[model samples]
Target: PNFSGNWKIIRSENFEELLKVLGVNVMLRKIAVAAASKQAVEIKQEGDTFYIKVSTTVYTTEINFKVGEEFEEQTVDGRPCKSLVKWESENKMVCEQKLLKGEGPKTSWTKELTNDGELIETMTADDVVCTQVFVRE
Candidate 1:
């Protein structure tokens, strides 16, 4: 999807609701949402392999994965999950994450480049969805 680049979040919608669904405290969710507008993502792509780095005001998180391969990952909040990334097309990709146990619902993220040359990330956590738009830096 041509998503490899240093990107900054331009906007986010309904992010707190997703966090709330995950059981985060109200104060924490608010802090997270407040930090969202200043977040940054760096994506590096090499054929079927990918590396993603995300940063907020005080921390950075990184992950590397290959297309179609399942890997273990821990969310920044320390929730461990099994993750799989796949390509729907040259211009679209999706990542599916499942908790290590059956206690949590599956969540998926769809990332694609838009007609206006922005990177749009759609986050779906069992129906509480969020759209975050990014611009290349």
Candidate 2:
């Protein structure tokens, strides 16, 4: 629940399907789901304010926000969205994204730290689910 640390993705499931449901172009999807692609994140939290930086093989961005506040976010694929992030429990944080354009599907993701100290990220878009597991570096 202390979401502070450097994390690296170690495994992913249904990544390609998730990309398809999100309307990602075939080329981008291929690159993102490639076996060698890498993704890492550094999270820092102080009180209620948080900062997270995610770097992928294709895109990188830094996010800043506070819990219980809806804020503007630029999705990994560059879509504009209003995002609300909240904690469901001490170890689970959930994020809901509403597309600003009014026609795209909503996206939701949850990051939960397990008892074994693994960070698991599960994402959903239009019924497609993608899950990635992370470990501290």
Clashes of each: 0, 0
Clash pairs for candidate 1 = none
Candidate 1, residue 124: lDDT: 78
For model 1 the local lDDT of residue 55 reads 88
Off by over 4 Å in 2: none
Best by lDDT: 1
TM-score of 2: 0.90
User: Which pairs of residues clash in candidate 2, taking residues 3 or more apart in a chain or in different chains?
Assistant: none
Note each model's CA RMSD in angstroms. Answer: 1.5, 1.7
Residue-wise C-alpha lDDT for candidate 2, range 23-75, written one tens digit per residue? 88899888878842487878898976789898877667898889999999865
Report the lDDT of model 1 for residue 127.
74
TM-score of each: 0.92, 0.90
lDDT of 1 by residue, 1-137 (tens): 46789999998999998887778899999998999888898999888888999888998889899989999887435688888988887777898888886566557788888878898888777878889999998
Q: For each candidate in the order shown, give its overall lDDT on alpha carbons.
A: 0.84, 0.83
